[PDB]
């Protein structure tokens, strides 16, 4: 495409335009990133440091940083994995058809075999947390040497699910009744376009001119701020 | 706990396919997900220097494969680590540029910021956590992974029988042209244009 | 829906049975598939628009180079066209005037461009005046404005180590009759750069 | 497994670790009954030859010729004046959106297509 957009120009954020709306006129407003979801995965500082020594005391982690840079292997992860492993092995544990079907169910639950890395749960030479202890695997055949059973490694799929559940974890009265209220709320376009990025418009503008617009803003916004503030201060001085 | 008409408690179900993925009005919640970082930028810089020393000293005994095997990394990751460290050391020792004056792209500057905050939060890894030879694991890896492109179908409709069915017609590998260099010197590069369909080869 | 291709002669019958609406741009058929044509004004007058609109529309009957005579609207305010005047004519429909389907290109031939025009200049053939060009450069001579927050911050942080344009240092905070000084390396940077590049 | 086996055999025969070598094992024979496994072991041994033996070491031809003509240069401070720029970062200043698709194809793509098959850059030649 080329030239200016001919037709209806809507904000890419999905917010309406009007006299008392976030936007005064029609436009794309792709530079206005405050109207889209940008997680804060870094730190934040303050304008002033009251302390007499520059210790970096104002610097602090952002709330979204704890979800941006997670840590896996925590004790609650371990506990959740243990409970879920018990529940997930319930089927093979309570199967009473035969060794063939038991192995089939075990392979379905945790694929493994030659050339594969499994948990070794069903292997005869691996220790399991049974409720009723029994022979590891009558008296005639056994292991005359010590040969302790090796430990069982985790189920990678289930452990990954448990670890990733954190990203999906979500954190009388003045009796005044609302009559101008909505029964079923409302679902505008902005609620979607704020966070679902793939629905928004891809710009045809040159990155050179995008950068130029940023540079112009960095120099012109303070002047407009001071223009309106000076209007207000002059009016107050005149009133005084 | 909902109802199922058949017994198949596994992770390979349409319900569990993309587990934890929103399937209702919660799709519009602005969730924050963990940021992805390269392994060659996650491992500790001292480990990078050690790997670079071993490789630049004895690339035979300390092969890329062996270094990755010992330090839990991939061959590509080891290669990237060595390249980056060699570039940085060349620049530093020749006094061409400091680590904060090499002109880079915006994407690489953002990557540097990402790793800086990752180290400040969790700290650099002291050992690699990758796998040498990735495994055949059923995972969602984009929309391209959810269909049989050759068959052009997402669903395999089939009949119920207790006896063998006719086999499916297998695809035949595409026979595409390739260029294979045969003679390269400081002045001329000669490569053979190969057409795999030509029957008379001589 | 395939009842229209019945029989053996479908390939000749059905292609005849199709929509027969007018061409999209038949309103300008007398340009003969050309972007624009020159013509001679045979008549120049003012016509009354169809109701409810009222007023007078400036129109001319013009004999194109093709020999056809057509009605042409004169867009803009004021014109000098008379009889025997040559005008370039383009496709444009004036809905008010009955039967008017062509307009005259301003600034071409004997049709002078609209006077006292500063917007939509390219649609009336008006050049960018020298005064406008000079103002489009002198306009961005940035103005210095303060809100007393600059004064507070200057007296709290900046006055301690500050340098005048000549390099002189400050020895006291800002008085009540002194404006906040400009930043010697940041204020009016673009305009100053352009002026210095020019000379 | 073949790479590990062959490399371990080579390292032990070379006594890389020992500070006081004990040269006793001198013949190591990997015997296999499967043609595929024997061929894989042979491939591993070939890679080991490439890595260890200077005769069998290989190098891309561009690198080979560049290092053969290798030269030592003397760079002064005044020779890097224009190797450095004013901007800290680099980014693409123009989008890649084509204004006229058919015109672009006719003017800048089609004239250079001397064959309709899609072929990649060849792998480098090993010398």
């Amino acid at each position: 495409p080329r030239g200016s957009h001919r037709g209806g120009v809507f904000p890419v954020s999905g917010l309406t335009w009007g006299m008392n709306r976030p936007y005064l006129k029609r436009g794309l407003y792709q530079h206005r990133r405050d109207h889209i979801f940008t997680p804060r995965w870094g730190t934040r500082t303050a304008n002033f440091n009251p302390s007499a020594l520059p210790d970096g005391s104002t610097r602090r982690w952002e709330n979204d940083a704890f979800k941006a840079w997670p840590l896996y292997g925590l004790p609650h992860h371990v506990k959740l994995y243990a409970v879920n492993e018990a529940r997930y092995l319930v089927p093979a544990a309570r199967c009473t058809a035969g060794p063939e079907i038991t192995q089939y169910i075990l392979n379905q639950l945790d694929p493994g075999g030659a050339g594969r890395n499994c948990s070794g749960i069903g292997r005869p030479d691996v220790r399991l947390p049974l409720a009723k202890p029994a022979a590891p695997s009558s008296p005639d055949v056994f292991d005359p040497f010590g040969t302790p059973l090796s430990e069982r490694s985790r189920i990678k799929r289930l452990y990954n699910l448990v670890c990733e559940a954190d990203s999906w974890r979500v954190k009388n009265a003045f009796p005044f009744v609302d009559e101008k209220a909505a029964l079923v709320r409302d679902l505008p376009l902005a609620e979607i376009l704020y966070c679902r990025h793939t629905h928004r418009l891809q710009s045809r503008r040159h990155p050179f001119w995008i950068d130029m617009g940023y540079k112009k803003r960095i120099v012109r916004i303070p002047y407009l701020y001071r223009r309106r503030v000076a209007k207000e201060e002059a009016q107050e001085r005149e009133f005084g | 706990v909902d109802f199922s008409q058949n017994r198949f408690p596994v992770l390979n179900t349409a319900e569990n396919f993309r587990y934890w993925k929103d399937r209702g009005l919660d799709r519009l919640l602005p969730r924050v997900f963990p940021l992805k970082l390269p392994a060659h930028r996650r491992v500790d810089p001292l480990l990078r220097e050690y790997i670079f020393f071993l490789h630049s000293m004895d690339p035979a005994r300390f092969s890329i494969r062996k270094l990755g095997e010992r330090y839990g990394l991939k061959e590509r990751t080891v290669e990237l680590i060595c390249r980056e460290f060699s570039v940085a050391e060349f620049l530093r020792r020749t006094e061409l540029a400091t680590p904060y004056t090499r002109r880079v792209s915006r994407e690489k500057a953002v990557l540097r910021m990402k790793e800086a905050l990752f180290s400040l939060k969790l700290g650099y890894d002291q050992l690699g956590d990758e796998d040498l030879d990735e495994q055949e694991e059923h995972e969602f890896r984009g929309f391209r992974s959810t269909q049989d492109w050759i068959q052009r179908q997402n669903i395999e409709v089939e009949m119920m029988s207790a006896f063998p069915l006719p086999a499916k017609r297998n695809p035949l590998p595409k026979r595409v042209d390739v260029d294979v260099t045969v003679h390269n010197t400081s002045k001329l590069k000669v490569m053979n244009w190969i057409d795999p369909n030509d029957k008379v080869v001589f | 829906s395939t009842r229209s291709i019945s029989g053996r002669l479908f390939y000749k019958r059905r292609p005849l049975q199709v929509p027969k609406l007018k061409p999209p741009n038949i309103r300008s058929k007398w340009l003969e598939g050309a972007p624009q044509k020159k013509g001679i004004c045979v008549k120049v007058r003012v016509q009354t628009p169809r109701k409810p609109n009222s007023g007078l529309r400036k129109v001319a009957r013009v004999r194109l180079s093709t020999g056809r005579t057509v009605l042409v609207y004169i867009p803009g305010i004021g014109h000098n066209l008379n009889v025997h005047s040559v005008v370039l004519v383009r496709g444009g429909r004036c809905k008010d005037v009955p039967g008017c389907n062509y307009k005259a290109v301003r600034g071409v031939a004997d049709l002078l461009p609209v006077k006292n025009r500063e917007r939509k200049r390219s649609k009336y053939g008006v050049k960018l005046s020298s005064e406008k060009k000079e103002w489009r450069l002198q306009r961005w001579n940035n103005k210095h404005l303060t809100i007393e927050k600059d004064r507070e911050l200057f007296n709290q942080f900046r006055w301690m180590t500050w340098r005048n344009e000549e390099g002189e240092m400050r020895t006291s905070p800002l008085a009540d009759d002194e404006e906040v000084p400009r930043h010697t390396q940041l204020f009016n940077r673009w305009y100053r750069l352009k002026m210095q590049r020019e000379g | 497994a073949a790479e590990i086996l062959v490399e371990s055999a080579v390292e032990q025969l070379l006594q890389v670790d020992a500070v006081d070598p004990n040269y006793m094992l001198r013949k190591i024979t990997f015997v296999d009954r499967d043609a595929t496994n024997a061929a894989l072991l042979a491939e591993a041994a070939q890679a080991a030859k490439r890595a260890w033996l200077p005769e069998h070491q290989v190098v891309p031809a561009p690198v080979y010729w560049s290092q053969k003509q290798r030269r030592l240069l003397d760079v002064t401070d005044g020779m890097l004046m224009f190797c450095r720029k004013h901007t800290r970062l680099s980014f693409k200043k123009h989008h890649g959106v084509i204004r006229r698709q058919k015109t672009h194809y006719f003017s800048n793509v089609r004239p250079f297509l001397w064959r309709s098959s899609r072929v990649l850059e060849p792998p480098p030649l090993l010398l």
Binding site: - | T101 | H144, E165, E179, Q185, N188, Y191, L193 | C83, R84
Partner: peptide
């Protein structure tokens, strides 16, 4: 409706060019 002064353009003071400090491989 004060907007500023504009009396001192500050054009006589030259704008120092940015240095070429960033290396390009």
């Amino acid at each position: 409706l004060v907007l500023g002064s504009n009396a001192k353009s500050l054009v006589d003071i030259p704008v120092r060019p940015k240095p070429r400090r960033f290396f390009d491989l």
